[PDB]
Amino acid sequence: ATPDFPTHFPKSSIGIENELAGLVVAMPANSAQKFGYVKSAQGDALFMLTKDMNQGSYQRPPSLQDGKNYQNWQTHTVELVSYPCEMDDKAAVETRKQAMLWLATHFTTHIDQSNHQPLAPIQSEDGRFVIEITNAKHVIAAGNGISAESQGQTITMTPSGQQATVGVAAKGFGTSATPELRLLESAPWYQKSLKSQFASLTSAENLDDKELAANVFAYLTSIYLKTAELAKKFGIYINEWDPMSEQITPNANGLTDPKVKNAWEILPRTKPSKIVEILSKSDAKAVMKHIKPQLQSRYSESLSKNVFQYFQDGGEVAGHGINNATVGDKHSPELAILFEFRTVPNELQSYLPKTE
């Protein structure tokens, strides 16, 4: 049992994803993504050990035949996924980086003397870190896992294998109140001009929280407009909208296609429809009613209707979202919305481990 991510943080939170180079994990087909985790000796979960990119079917090297069944097993790259922590918690950020670098050195020894064997649950030499194995039905192998012996690889990490995910209070997006919020608001798809635009459209309206409504409107409208732009650009089938009806040839497999996710740069990871909950029933109605013409003044009726309905019925920006994250008082929790930095920017590089 790999522990689930904590969902609540007092303020902004950060998680990291780190794909390793130099080895693979092989596991039975249709196995769970998580096969273990690393915790501090104190018991705090630091990161998960996961399979990531499928690298083809696993073939046990004949020189390592052990009478064991490896039928239908698949090879994957290994990705280290941190348990989120508070963005300003220096010790927690540092312990995650150090534990990942330690595990990479441990993997370097593992492929040298225990190639094509599962990782064992052990404690680090200095006693700082502990490996827990949740799926023993795995093997770790050097390189691409075809040869019985390694090429003496050092297990490494690189910016191209790294992402960071930032979680903030949903009510904060558009307020520019913190450096994290300002970094998120710098996303090219976010149109800050929409805040003042909403205020102009709703003067005769007596809104419960006009500034919160304007922020929600700018956030949702920016996402809806960007989705329509990407659907047109990449020829994506959204709801009932057919790109071929507008003479657009598909050039992506959908919203989850890595090139589509890369085009967001700062990728929303939370279901857009969740944000409506931060407003009163009345204010939410006013925000939603005003989004439709923003799409319709820029996109065809069919694309506008389909994007609007898609997000209204709880559609996700790019597959399964992180929709249960909260911020503030643990007792009266507030919605947190998450964002994935496809490439780690200079502002967040200090959160990522660097191979020495």
Q: Does 180 bind Mg ion (CB under 5 A)?
A: no
Residues linked to residue 19 through DSSP beta bridges, in sequence order: 79
Residue nearest to ligand ATP (CB): 15
Nearest to Mg ion of 263, 286 (CB atom): 263
CA distance 260 to 263: 5
Nearest to Mg ion of 77, 215 (CB atom): 77
Least Å distance, CB 180 to ligand ATP, is 11
Q: Does 163 bind Mg ion (CB under 5 A)?
A: yes
15 assigned to a ligand binding site: yes
27-86 positions binding Mg ion, by CB under 5 A:
81
Break the chain down into helix, strand, coil percent, rounded to 5: 35, 25, 40
Q: Does 283 bind Mg ion (CB under 5 A)?
A: no
In the list ligand ATP, Mg ion, none, the entry touching 320 (Cβ below 5 to 8 angstroms by class) is ligand ATP
Structure tokens at 328: 């503030």
Nearest to Mg ion of 236, 267 (CB atom): 267
**Residue numbers at the binding site for ligand ATP (CB under 6 A):** 5, 13-17, 81-82, 84, 165, 167, 319-320, 322, 325, 336, 338
Q: Residues, the chain, total?
A: 356
Least Å distance, CB 85 to ligand ATP, is 8
16 assigned to a ligand binding site: yes
Measure CA of the first residue to CA of the last residue in the chain; give whole Å. 32
Measured from the Cβ of residue 132, the count of other Cβ atoms closer than 10 Å reads 16
User: Taking the CA of residue 329 as centre, how many other CA atoms within 13 Å lie in the half-sphere pointing to its CB?
Assistant: 2
- Find the largest Cα–Cα distance for the chain: 79
Cα 165–Cα 22–Cα 69 angle in degrees, nearest 5: 100
Residue type at 147 in one-letter notation: S
4-23 positions binding Mg ion, by CB under 5 A:
17
Nearest to Mg ion of 25, 276 (CB atom): 25
List of residues contacting Mg ion (CB under 5 A): 17, 81, 163
